[PDB]
């Protein structure tokens, strides 16, 4: 039985750990939450308190914590050999097998893959591949990237990301990015049917393409369901119409499946959910269930043939691309995910969670409860009629974070509300634990 | 395992979009599939043995086959595989690694944010420098000073920081605010000069560039102690103290890129110790885990961290796998082995021996210069010593040298400029002789 020195860990963390995505000022005064153990959907802190991992780490622990199978896979590969580069025509067996398996799993001619270590690396690779593809085609001015407001594609991709809070204070951003409106009906589609809202979004896309010039737009990048931006579930028919416009102008479609991928939405990939076939797909997170950092980009046969038609070295790559340990762990994780058909439980548990959490809509401070599969959000507002958010001085995010953690729940708490992305294995009883914790924390903060 | 070599080659050609590879050549010839490693040795799918003369990608410092790191990874994965460092969360291995790095990195370099790679680390450092100046009320201080032949990654601002134009070509526009200085490359840029005169010229160029741009607009200077991917450019004696003195004179932050040099490659634990420099920000990757698990990081001084922590706001930057518990645990075990075996010492000794033996190759008419620091070594190939002319692209010196070296059982970086070697810090005298003989034989095969 492992024993931790919580005070020592807190002191060392405050002294030496520059947390990402954290209020460092608050961290120095209050300290971190140190998690030391995990099983399934449960985690334990250094003091022995139990929490439900309602966010699956960072949308990524899809098959749950404590899977010995993945640990043994990593151990076996590391003992055999830990690192073989994919540079200079080198490769390891797990990397090759993962590439072939992903060619099978991703529908259609999405058959060529280059691996990375994260979602931001993957999106950066996809953008560069689109621009390089048009460059090889003799269209060097076709570099502009279409993205959306509230989109999140990484902080390295940072320009593609549509949340402005990530930009402030970090200096200039790479140019060539055009931001469209997010298919966010609650605030942008008031008093509209789904059809009319989709029509307006399509009109905006057409007008933007006309304004910029279709020959200057390399690609469109987007998530099937936007995740970090605020769990924006698109209206019915949005993706087919948007993809049709893009195909009309020849603009490449980059589908960001970093969060939606590998079973979160109720299917293996969100593209299946929305009947879209992208030219480029990006993935990360759930591919390994977060056990080892892994990401990747998959491209169509046409794009790959264009890239492979040049008798020159492809001048792009990250050092750990195709890491053998990551790929072996990914193969085992895919074995478990497919064998247990987790996307089915994701669909069922997500529907149950959405149904129960929608009861929170009765409360005066709950504007909207929305979700797709296991991606769920409770948007908190000061007033339902106006839809006005709580002001920054109220510190809704920190208060909700503290309340949820005190009630043994770990969920993303933001100024806009509560975001839940539990592991795909969550049972109904664990779903009830999450529901009651979220409701009680909301009552604690807002009555 | 149930793999056959031919099936692996076919599947790789069909489905693997290799990075840093001639895809046209790959489709015709297929990949070199490595399946097993121990120490400095690797084996391909057909059972042929090779010396890992590049340590993968400058990163397998303690060598292949260390069961201790595998056991650390297994233990951590069973206990908990992923705990985010976002939202004030952390795991014990991440915290312990941060404290240990605070001890190991000299001076007030005591605050760390982890990443999964070198490019992530350099992007984090650039953003941290700009954000630091922004918090200080200097939003116009965003320009980043870099050098020709510098390599800091191919993503995000790192791509701009990199000074090799071949990486830029065809990928579209890059983030603005990067200024490129001349590389301290004496062999071609400091001809007929002493080290002192060359350093004086470089200092003059840096000062005049700062004056032109305006020091108040320059957030930081980023550079490697020894440039690695750019061509193993060993700086002249006294270069780093003078450059750092100028930077401090204007208040410009110094970002030292220790992704390659870090963790014992140069003969000391970090390259900053070799060249007597104290950076405000340091970036690291590769050797920290010996490549066993993807890990990188950024370390900042107490002043920068205090400035960042003085703002009552969320720090809106981070990569998902920052501080991965398995990576940090493997890093702790790797550091245990590196410190206990004092690998920097063997790096210094073996590097000196390799440089001494390889410098003999300078007797050949096609070897322009052999240079190295620690275990970083390069043989620059030229058509003629007097002319110093590079072989033209049509000769395909890089591919020919690659094929020749692989045929002779050695894996080394072969480029149009020559041969680059970055062997595991554990390389012995006999393995060094194997590497030397293989390189000489490969050079004779291609150029006689
Ligand atoms: C000094 C340096 N910094 C950064 C990088 C990029 O690292 P990564 O591929 O992990 O992003 C490299 C690549 N070898 C490097 O040599």
mmCIF file of N, CA and C in Angstrom, chain A residues 4 12 15-16 18-23 25 28 32-36 38 60 70 80 83 86-91 93 97 103 111-114 124 128 132 155-156 168-170 172 174 285 290-291 305 310-312 314-317 319-320 323 405 412, chain B residues 1 11 14-15 17-22 24 27 31-35 37 59 67 77 79 82 85-90 92 96 102 110-113 123 127 131 154 156 169-171 175-176 286 291-292 306 311-313 315-318 320-321 324 406 413:
data_model
loop_
_atom_site.group_PDB
_atom_site.id
_atom_site.type_symbol
_atom_site.label_atom_id
_atom_site.label_comp_id
_atom_site.label_asym_id
_atom_site.label_seq_id
_atom_site.Cartn_x
_atom_site.Cartn_y
_atom_site.Cartn_z
ATOM 1 N N UNK A 4 1.875 8.499 0.583
ATOM 2 C CA UNK A 4 2.361 9.762 0.056
ATOM 3 C C UNK A 4 2.493 10.788 1.172
ATOM 4 N N UNK A 12 6.648 21.088 -2.881
ATOM 5 C CA UNK A 12 7.504 20.956 -4.055
ATOM 6 C C UNK A 12 6.804 21.459 -5.313
ATOM 7 N N UNK A 15 6.750 25.181 -5.305
ATOM 8 C CA UNK A 15 8.089 25.732 -5.473
ATOM 9 C C UNK A 15 8.595 25.602 -6.907
ATOM 10 N N UNK A 16 8.261 24.508 -7.600
ATOM 11 C CA UNK A 16 8.963 24.186 -8.839
ATOM 12 C C UNK A 16 8.097 23.899 -10.062
ATOM 13 N N UNK A 18 5.482 24.889 -12.877
ATOM 14 C CA UNK A 18 4.785 25.940 -13.621
ATOM 15 C C UNK A 18 3.630 25.291 -14.377
ATOM 16 N N UNK A 19 2.493 25.162 -13.698
ATOM 17 C CA UNK A 19 1.359 24.432 -14.250
ATOM 18 C C UNK A 19 0.871 25.077 -15.547
ATOM 19 N N UNK A 20 0.483 24.283 -16.541
ATOM 20 C CA UNK A 20 -0.254 24.829 -17.681
ATOM 21 C C UNK A 20 -1.737 24.951 -17.364
ATOM 22 N N UNK A 21 -2.379 25.922 -18.017
ATOM 23 C CA UNK A 21 -3.825 26.133 -17.901
ATOM 24 C C UNK A 21 -4.257 26.245 -16.442
ATOM 25 N N UNK A 22 -3.495 27.009 -15.665
ATOM 26 C CA UNK A 22 -3.729 27.143 -14.236
ATOM 27 C C UNK A 22 -3.517 28.592 -13.826
ATOM 28 N N UNK A 23 -4.285 29.030 -12.832
ATOM 29 C CA UNK A 23 -4.066 30.334 -12.215
ATOM 30 C C UNK A 23 -2.890 30.172 -11.263
ATOM 31 N N UNK A 25 -1.203 32.372 -9.656
ATOM 32 C CA UNK A 25 -1.416 33.167 -8.452
ATOM 33 C C UNK A 25 -2.246 32.389 -7.439
ATOM 34 N N UNK A 28 -0.182 29.227 -6.012
ATOM 35 C CA UNK A 28 0.788 29.485 -4.950
ATOM 36 C C UNK A 28 0.107 29.604 -3.590
ATOM 37 N N UNK A 32 -1.769 22.566 -5.318
ATOM 38 C CA UNK A 32 -2.397 21.723 -6.334
ATOM 39 C C UNK A 32 -3.238 20.608 -5.720
ATOM 40 N N UNK A 33 -3.983 19.931 -6.589
ATOM 41 C CA UNK A 33 -4.652 18.682 -6.249
ATOM 42 C C UNK A 33 -3.800 17.554 -6.817
ATOM 43 N N UNK A 34 -3.149 16.802 -5.936
ATOM 44 C CA UNK A 34 -2.166 15.800 -6.328
ATOM 45 C C UNK A 34 -2.867 14.452 -6.396
ATOM 46 N N UNK A 35 -2.996 13.908 -7.604
ATOM 47 C CA UNK A 35 -3.618 12.610 -7.824
ATOM 48 C C UNK A 35 -2.530 11.552 -7.948
ATOM 49 N N UNK A 36 -2.699 10.443 -7.230
ATOM 50 C CA UNK A 36 -1.643 9.448 -7.086
ATOM 51 C C UNK A 36 -2.046 8.066 -7.571
ATOM 52 N N UNK A 38 -5.202 5.541 -9.817
ATOM 53 C CA UNK A 38 -6.403 5.482 -10.608
ATOM 54 C C UNK A 38 -6.877 4.084 -10.917
ATOM 55 N N UNK A 60 -9.380 12.076 -22.589
ATOM 56 C CA UNK A 60 -8.541 11.087 -23.258
ATOM 57 C C UNK A 60 -8.458 9.713 -22.606
ATOM 58 N N UNK A 70 -2.203 -2.523 -20.995
ATOM 59 C CA UNK A 70 -1.407 -1.474 -21.624
ATOM 60 C C UNK A 70 -0.043 -1.340 -20.957
ATOM 61 N N UNK A 80 12.100 -4.795 -25.431
ATOM 62 C CA UNK A 80 12.571 -5.160 -26.761
ATOM 63 C C UNK A 80 13.359 -4.017 -27.394
ATOM 64 N N UNK A 83 12.911 3.155 -28.478
ATOM 65 C CA UNK A 83 12.799 4.221 -29.469
ATOM 66 C C UNK A 83 13.452 3.812 -30.779
ATOM 67 N N UNK A 86 11.103 7.329 -36.980
ATOM 68 C CA UNK A 86 10.491 7.187 -38.290
ATOM 69 C C UNK A 86 11.150 8.090 -39.320
ATOM 70 N N UNK A 87 12.165 8.846 -38.910
ATOM 71 C CA UNK A 87 12.948 9.671 -39.813
ATOM 72 C C UNK A 87 13.801 8.795 -40.726
ATOM 73 N N UNK A 88 14.222 9.383 -41.847
ATOM 74 C CA UNK A 88 15.223 8.788 -42.737
ATOM 75 C C UNK A 88 14.824 7.393 -43.210
ATOM 76 N N UNK A 89 13.526 7.159 -43.385
ATOM 77 C CA UNK A 89 13.070 5.865 -43.849
ATOM 78 C C UNK A 89 13.128 4.753 -42.829
ATOM 79 N N UNK A 90 13.321 5.071 -41.554
ATOM 80 C CA UNK A 90 13.326 4.066 -40.502
ATOM 81 C C UNK A 90 11.914 3.875 -39.953
ATOM 82 N N UNK A 91 11.682 2.713 -39.348
ATOM 83 C CA UNK A 91 10.395 2.428 -38.722
ATOM 84 C C UNK A 91 10.529 1.199 -37.835
ATOM 85 N N UNK A 93 8.132 -2.139 -36.008
ATOM 86 C CA UNK A 93 6.941 -2.949 -36.324
ATOM 87 C C UNK A 93 5.659 -2.385 -35.727
ATOM 88 N N UNK A 97 2.323 -1.486 -37.997
ATOM 89 C CA UNK A 97 1.063 -2.175 -37.739
ATOM 90 C C UNK A 97 -0.035 -1.192 -37.357
ATOM 91 N N UNK A 103 -5.505 2.617 -41.129
ATOM 92 C CA UNK A 103 -6.021 2.635 -42.494
ATOM 93 C C UNK A 103 -7.296 1.813 -42.595
ATOM 94 N N UNK A 111 -5.851 6.468 -45.737
ATOM 95 C CA UNK A 111 -4.992 5.309 -45.587
ATOM 96 C C UNK A 111 -3.527 5.633 -45.340
ATOM 97 N N UNK A 112 -3.124 6.902 -45.260
ATOM 98 C CA UNK A 112 -1.711 7.197 -45.062
ATOM 99 C C UNK A 112 -1.533 8.045 -43.811
ATOM 100 N N UNK A 113 -0.621 7.642 -42.930
ATOM 101 C CA UNK A 113 -0.556 8.244 -41.605
ATOM 102 C C UNK A 113 0.860 8.662 -41.242
ATOM 103 N N UNK A 114 0.961 9.816 -40.585
ATOM 104 C CA UNK A 114 2.188 10.265 -39.938
ATOM 105 C C UNK A 114 1.874 10.573 -38.484
ATOM 106 N N UNK A 124 -0.978 20.966 -36.448
ATOM 107 C CA UNK A 124 0.124 21.735 -37.086
ATOM 108 C C UNK A 124 0.594 20.961 -38.324
ATOM 109 N N UNK A 128 0.229 22.159 -42.306
ATOM 110 C CA UNK A 128 1.415 22.190 -43.152
ATOM 111 C C UNK A 128 1.267 21.256 -44.345
ATOM 112 N N UNK A 132 1.485 22.421 -48.151
ATOM 113 C CA UNK A 132 2.504 21.768 -48.967
ATOM 114 C C UNK A 132 1.887 21.037 -50.154
ATOM 115 N N UNK A 155 -2.310 25.034 -29.007
ATOM 116 C CA UNK A 155 -1.720 26.311 -28.613
ATOM 117 C C UNK A 155 -0.294 26.468 -29.141
ATOM 118 N N UNK A 156 0.075 25.702 -30.160
ATOM 119 C CA UNK A 156 1.384 25.852 -30.786
ATOM 120 C C UNK A 156 1.200 26.367 -32.207
ATOM 121 N N UNK A 168 -4.203 36.165 -26.003
ATOM 122 C CA UNK A 168 -3.785 37.383 -25.315
ATOM 123 C C UNK A 168 -2.419 37.241 -24.650
ATOM 124 N N UNK A 169 -1.540 38.193 -24.953
ATOM 125 C CA UNK A 169 -0.241 38.294 -24.333
ATOM 126 C C UNK A 169 0.840 37.419 -24.925
ATOM 127 N N UNK A 170 0.530 36.580 -25.911
ATOM 128 C CA UNK A 170 1.517 35.676 -26.488
ATOM 129 C C UNK A 170 2.110 36.193 -27.794
ATOM 130 N N UNK A 172 2.338 37.969 -31.759
ATOM 131 C CA UNK A 172 1.690 37.777 -33.059
ATOM 132 C C UNK A 172 1.457 36.307 -33.366
ATOM 133 N N UNK A 174 0.539 33.219 -36.481
ATOM 134 C CA UNK A 174 0.719 32.914 -37.903
ATOM 135 C C UNK A 174 -0.475 33.373 -38.716
ATOM 136 N N UNK A 285 -4.977 11.758 -28.032
ATOM 137 C CA UNK A 285 -5.710 11.424 -26.818
ATOM 138 C C UNK A 285 -6.113 9.951 -26.757
ATOM 139 N N UNK A 290 -4.599 7.954 -23.258
ATOM 140 C CA UNK A 290 -3.717 8.801 -22.486
ATOM 141 C C UNK A 290 -2.585 8.079 -21.795
ATOM 142 N N UNK A 291 -2.465 6.763 -21.981
ATOM 143 C CA UNK A 291 -1.427 6.002 -21.289
ATOM 144 C C UNK A 291 -0.032 6.396 -21.761
ATOM 145 N N UNK A 305 -0.383 10.440 -52.602
ATOM 146 C CA UNK A 305 0.241 10.261 -53.909
ATOM 147 C C UNK A 305 0.896 11.551 -54.379
ATOM 148 N N UNK A 310 6.976 13.745 -55.428
ATOM 149 C CA UNK A 310 8.138 14.622 -55.465
ATOM 150 C C UNK A 310 9.389 13.860 -55.049
ATOM 151 N N UNK A 311 10.410 13.887 -55.909
ATOM 152 C CA UNK A 311 11.689 13.242 -55.610
ATOM 153 C C UNK A 311 12.531 14.189 -54.755
ATOM 154 N N UNK A 312 12.105 14.325 -53.503
ATOM 155 C CA UNK A 312 12.760 15.188 -52.532
ATOM 156 C C UNK A 312 12.374 14.701 -51.145
ATOM 157 N N UNK A 314 10.777 15.013 -47.542
ATOM 158 C CA UNK A 314 9.663 15.728 -46.926
ATOM 159 C C UNK A 314 10.158 16.411 -45.655
ATOM 160 N N UNK A 315 10.279 17.738 -45.702
ATOM 161 C CA UNK A 315 10.934 18.506 -44.643
ATOM 162 C C UNK A 315 9.958 18.845 -43.514
ATOM 163 N N UNK A 316 9.421 17.799 -42.895
ATOM 164 C CA UNK A 316 8.577 17.970 -41.722
ATOM 165 C C UNK A 316 8.655 16.720 -40.865
ATOM 166 N N UNK A 317 8.705 16.917 -39.551
ATOM 167 C CA UNK A 317 8.673 15.802 -38.631
ATOM 168 C C UNK A 317 9.012 16.162 -37.202
ATOM 169 N N UNK A 319 10.359 14.680 -33.439
ATOM 170 C CA UNK A 319 11.354 13.676 -33.075
ATOM 171 C C UNK A 319 10.707 12.346 -32.706
ATOM 172 N N UNK A 320 9.617 12.385 -31.944
ATOM 173 C CA UNK A 320 8.997 11.180 -31.414
ATOM 174 C C UNK A 320 7.871 10.651 -32.294
ATOM 175 N N UNK A 323 6.575 6.745 -32.166
ATOM 176 C CA UNK A 323 7.292 6.147 -31.051
ATOM 177 C C UNK A 323 6.835 4.702 -30.842
ATOM 178 N N UNK A 405 -14.760 19.515 -6.600
ATOM 179 C CA UNK A 405 -13.675 18.732 -6.021
ATOM 180 C C UNK A 405 -13.963 18.360 -4.570
ATOM 181 N N UNK A 412 -14.543 19.745 -15.673
ATOM 182 C CA UNK A 412 -13.983 21.057 -16.083
ATOM 183 C C UNK A 412 -14.972 22.156 -15.682
ATOM 184 N N UNK B 1 4.761 -11.290 -30.774
ATOM 185 C CA UNK B 1 4.858 -10.682 -32.096
ATOM 186 C C UNK B 1 4.622 -11.713 -33.193
ATOM 187 N N UNK B 11 3.409 -3.028 -45.833
ATOM 188 C CA UNK B 11 2.488 -2.207 -45.056
ATOM 189 C C UNK B 11 3.038 -0.802 -44.849
ATOM 190 N N UNK B 14 2.619 1.101 -47.987
ATOM 191 C CA UNK B 14 1.211 1.364 -48.268
ATOM 192 C C UNK B 14 0.628 2.445 -47.360
ATOM 193 N N UNK B 15 1.050 2.500 -46.091
ATOM 194 C CA UNK B 15 0.312 3.280 -45.103
ATOM 195 C C UNK B 15 1.119 4.274 -44.273
ATOM 196 N N UNK B 17 3.361 7.506 -43.809
ATOM 197 C CA UNK B 17 3.853 8.770 -44.358
ATOM 198 C C UNK B 17 5.020 9.228 -43.490
ATOM 199 N N UNK B 18 6.212 8.733 -43.815
ATOM 200 C CA UNK B 18 7.382 8.971 -42.981
ATOM 201 C C UNK B 18 7.691 10.462 -42.879
ATOM 202 N N UNK B 19 8.101 10.943 -41.709
ATOM 203 C CA UNK B 19 8.681 12.283 -41.621
ATOM 204 C C UNK B 19 10.156 12.261 -41.991
ATOM 205 N N UNK B 20 10.628 13.395 -42.514
ATOM 206 C CA UNK B 20 12.042 13.583 -42.850
ATOM 207 C C UNK B 20 12.553 12.458 -43.748
ATOM 208 N N UNK B 21 11.752 12.104 -44.750
ATOM 209 C CA UNK B 21 12.059 10.992 -45.638
ATOM 210 C C UNK B 21 11.685 11.372 -47.063
ATOM 211 N N UNK B 22 12.448 10.852 -48.022
ATOM 212 C CA UNK B 22 12.098 10.986 -49.433
ATOM 213 C C UNK B 22 11.012 9.958 -49.716
ATOM 214 N N UNK B 24 9.154 9.553 -52.309
ATOM 215 C CA UNK B 24 9.340 8.975 -53.635
ATOM 216 C C UNK B 24 10.340 7.826 -53.581
ATOM 217 N N UNK B 27 8.844 4.716 -51.478
ATOM 218 C CA UNK B 27 7.924 3.828 -52.181
ATOM 219 C C UNK B 27 8.676 2.829 -53.055
ATOM 220 N N UNK B 31 11.314 0.823 -46.327
ATOM 221 C CA UNK B 31 11.995 1.330 -45.137
ATOM 222 C C UNK B 31 13.027 0.345 -44.597
ATOM 223 N N UNK B 32 13.809 0.832 -43.636
ATOM 224 C CA UNK B 32 14.675 -0.010 -42.820
ATOM 225 C C UNK B 32 13.961 -0.215 -41.488
ATOM 226 N N UNK B 33 13.489 -1.433 -41.252
ATOM 227 C CA UNK B 33 12.631 -1.740 -40.113
ATOM 228 C C UNK B 33 13.508 -2.267 -38.986
ATOM 229 N N UNK B 34 13.610 -1.499 -37.906
ATOM 230 C CA UNK B 34 14.379 -1.885 -36.730
ATOM 231 C C UNK B 34 13.430 -2.466 -35.690
ATOM 232 N N UNK B 35 13.796 -3.618 -35.132
ATOM 233 C CA UNK B 35 12.887 -4.386 -34.288
ATOM 234 C C UNK B 35 13.421 -4.633 -32.886
ATOM 235 N N UNK B 37 16.744 -3.661 -29.785
ATOM 236 C CA UNK B 37 17.914 -2.901 -29.391
ATOM 237 C C UNK B 37 18.502 -3.288 -28.048
ATOM 238 N N UNK B 59 19.050 11.032 -28.882
ATOM 239 C CA UNK B 59 18.292 10.972 -27.636
ATOM 240 C C UNK B 59 18.443 9.701 -26.810
ATOM 241 N N UNK B 67 15.986 -2.394 -18.608
ATOM 242 C CA UNK B 67 14.773 -2.919 -17.990
ATOM 243 C C UNK B 67 14.278 -2.054 -16.838
ATOM 244 N N UNK B 77 2.182 3.084 -15.007
ATOM 245 C CA UNK B 77 0.971 2.874 -15.795
ATOM 246 C C UNK B 77 -0.075 2.101 -15.007
ATOM 247 N N UNK B 79 -0.334 2.077 -11.644
ATOM 248 C CA UNK B 79 -0.822 2.930 -10.561
ATOM 249 C C UNK B 79 -1.752 4.024 -11.081
ATOM 250 N N UNK B 82 -2.287 8.560 -16.628
ATOM 251 C CA UNK B 82 -2.391 9.960 -17.015
ATOM 252 C C UNK B 82 -3.081 10.746 -15.915
ATOM 253 N N UNK B 85 -1.653 18.062 -15.759
ATOM 254 C CA UNK B 85 -1.111 19.171 -14.995
ATOM 255 C C UNK B 85 -1.949 20.426 -15.175
ATOM 256 N N UNK B 86 -3.018 20.335 -15.962
ATOM 257 C CA UNK B 86 -3.968 21.420 -16.132
ATOM 258 C C UNK B 86 -4.767 21.627 -14.850
ATOM 259 N N UNK B 87 -5.341 22.825 -14.723
ATOM 260 C CA UNK B 87 -6.326 23.133 -13.684
ATOM 261 C C UNK B 87 -5.798 22.852 -12.280
ATOM 262 N N UNK B 88 -4.498 23.043 -12.070
ATOM 263 C CA UNK B 88 -3.926 22.817 -10.759
ATOM 264 C C UNK B 88 -3.773 21.367 -10.361
ATOM 265 N N UNK B 89 -3.907 20.434 -11.295
ATOM 266 C CA UNK B 89 -3.710 19.023 -11.003
ATOM 267 C C UNK B 89 -2.249 18.645 -11.222
ATOM 268 N N UNK B 90 -1.826 17.564 -10.571
ATOM 269 C CA UNK B 90 -0.467 17.064 -10.746
ATOM 270 C C UNK B 90 -0.370 15.660 -10.169
ATOM 271 N N UNK B 92 2.590 12.702 -8.504
ATOM 272 C CA UNK B 92 3.853 12.705 -7.743
ATOM 273 C C UNK B 92 5.088 12.662 -8.632
ATOM 274 N N UNK B 96 8.103 15.490 -8.397
ATOM 275 C CA UNK B 96 9.459 15.091 -8.035
ATOM 276 C C UNK B 96 10.446 15.416 -9.148
ATOM 277 N N UNK B 102 15.078 21.301 -10.753
ATOM 278 C CA UNK B 102 15.478 22.536 -10.087
ATOM 279 C C UNK B 102 16.840 22.375 -9.428
ATOM 280 N N UNK B 110 14.542 27.228 -11.612
ATOM 281 C CA UNK B 110 13.851 26.385 -10.654
ATOM 282 C C UNK B 110 12.380 26.143 -10.956
ATOM 283 N N UNK B 111 11.820 26.678 -12.043
ATOM 284 C CA UNK B 111 10.399 26.474 -12.297
ATOM 285 C C UNK B 111 10.206 25.830 -13.661
ATOM 286 N N UNK B 112 9.420 24.757 -13.720
ATOM 287 C CA UNK B 112 9.379 23.937 -14.922
ATOM 288 C C UNK B 112 7.952 23.658 -15.371
ATOM 289 N N UNK B 113 7.757 23.685 -16.689
ATOM 290 C CA UNK B 113 6.538 23.201 -17.326
ATOM 291 C C UNK B 113 6.925 22.173 -18.376
ATOM 292 N N UNK B 123 8.384 26.347 -28.443
ATOM 293 C CA UNK B 123 7.189 27.176 -28.558
ATOM 294 C C UNK B 123 6.757 27.697 -27.195
ATOM 295 N N UNK B 127 6.610 31.688 -26.178
ATOM 296 C CA UNK B 127 5.373 32.259 -25.661
ATOM 297 C C UNK B 127 5.558 32.786 -24.244
ATOM 298 N N UNK B 131 4.927 36.580 -23.170
ATOM 299 C CA UNK B 131 3.959 36.802 -22.100
ATOM 300 C C UNK B 131 4.597 37.506 -20.909
ATOM 301 N N UNK B 154 10.056 22.276 -35.999
ATOM 302 C CA UNK B 154 9.392 22.615 -37.249
ATOM 303 C C UNK B 154 7.909 22.926 -37.046
ATOM 304 N N UNK B 156 5.092 25.733 -35.288
ATOM 305 C CA UNK B 156 4.720 26.951 -34.566
ATOM 306 C C UNK B 156 5.922 27.899 -34.581
ATOM 307 N N UNK B 169 10.543 25.719 -46.840
ATOM 308 C CA UNK B 169 10.079 25.684 -48.223
ATOM 309 C C UNK B 169 8.763 24.930 -48.379
ATOM 310 N N UNK B 170 7.792 25.587 -49.012
ATOM 311 C CA UNK B 170 6.540 24.971 -49.398
ATOM 312 C C UNK B 170 5.475 24.881 -48.328
ATOM 313 N N UNK B 171 5.754 25.310 -47.100
ATOM 314 C CA UNK B 171 4.799 25.179 -46.008
ATOM 315 C C UNK B 171 4.017 26.457 -45.727
ATOM 316 N N UNK B 175 4.965 32.499 -38.479
ATOM 317 C CA UNK B 175 4.651 33.561 -37.519
ATOM 318 C C UNK B 175 5.692 34.687 -37.586
ATOM 319 N N UNK B 176 5.264 35.969 -37.598
ATOM 320 C CA UNK B 176 6.185 37.108 -37.670
ATOM 321 C C UNK B 176 6.871 37.435 -36.335
ATOM 322 N N UNK B 286 14.453 14.933 -25.565
ATOM 323 C CA UNK B 286 15.344 13.862 -25.994
ATOM 324 C C UNK B 286 15.907 13.071 -24.818
ATOM 325 N N UNK B 291 14.783 8.815 -24.672
ATOM 326 C CA UNK B 291 13.859 8.474 -25.730
ATOM 327 C C UNK B 291 12.893 7.360 -25.402
ATOM 328 N N UNK B 292 12.926 6.830 -24.177
ATOM 329 C CA UNK B 292 12.047 5.717 -23.827
ATOM 330 C C UNK B 292 10.580 6.137 -23.814
ATOM 331 N N UNK B 306 8.120 34.345 -10.957
ATOM 332 C CA UNK B 306 7.456 35.283 -10.058
ATOM 333 C C UNK B 306 6.587 36.260 -10.838
ATOM 334 N N UNK B 311 0.212 37.494 -11.621
ATOM 335 C CA UNK B 311 -1.049 37.846 -12.259
ATOM 336 C C UNK B 311 -2.159 36.920 -11.775
ATOM 337 N N UNK B 312 -3.241 37.513 -11.266
ATOM 338 C CA UNK B 312 -4.403 36.754 -10.803
ATOM 339 C C UNK B 312 -5.288 36.423 -12.006
ATOM 340 N N UNK B 313 -4.793 35.490 -12.815
ATOM 341 C CA UNK B 313 -5.480 35.062 -14.024
ATOM 342 C C UNK B 313 -4.971 33.678 -14.394
ATOM 343 N N UNK B 315 -3.178 31.044 -16.690
ATOM 344 C CA UNK B 315 -2.126 31.023 -17.700
ATOM 345 C C UNK B 315 -2.640 30.213 -18.884
ATOM 346 N N UNK B 316 -3.008 30.902 -19.963
ATOM 347 C CA UNK B 316 -3.711 30.275 -21.082
ATOM 348 C C UNK B 316 -2.725 29.662 -22.079
ATOM 349 N N UNK B 317 -1.948 28.698 -21.589
ATOM 350 C CA UNK B 317 -1.038 27.954 -22.446
ATOM 351 C C UNK B 317 -0.809 26.572 -21.856
ATOM 352 N N UNK B 318 -0.775 25.565 -22.724
ATOM 353 C CA UNK B 318 -0.459 24.220 -22.288
ATOM 354 C C UNK B 318 -0.740 23.147 -23.317
ATOM 355 N N UNK B 320 -1.569 19.045 -23.993
ATOM 356 C CA UNK B 320 -2.398 18.091 -23.258
ATOM 357 C C UNK B 320 -1.565 17.172 -22.371
ATOM 358 N N UNK B 321 -0.442 16.676 -22.884
ATOM 359 C CA UNK B 321 0.349 15.674 -22.185
ATOM 360 C C UNK B 321 1.461 16.279 -21.337
ATOM 361 N N UNK B 324 3.275 14.267 -18.191
ATOM 362 C CA UNK B 324 2.727 12.919 -18.212
ATOM 363 C C UNK B 324 3.382 12.066 -17.125
ATOM 364 N N UNK B 406 24.657 2.029 -44.074
ATOM 365 C CA UNK B 406 23.731 0.954 -43.620
ATOM 366 C C UNK B 406 24.258 -0.413 -44.067
ATOM 367 N N UNK B 413 23.663 9.802 -39.446
ATOM 368 C CA UNK B 413 22.916 10.761 -40.247
ATOM 369 C C UNK B 413 23.738 11.147 -41.470
#
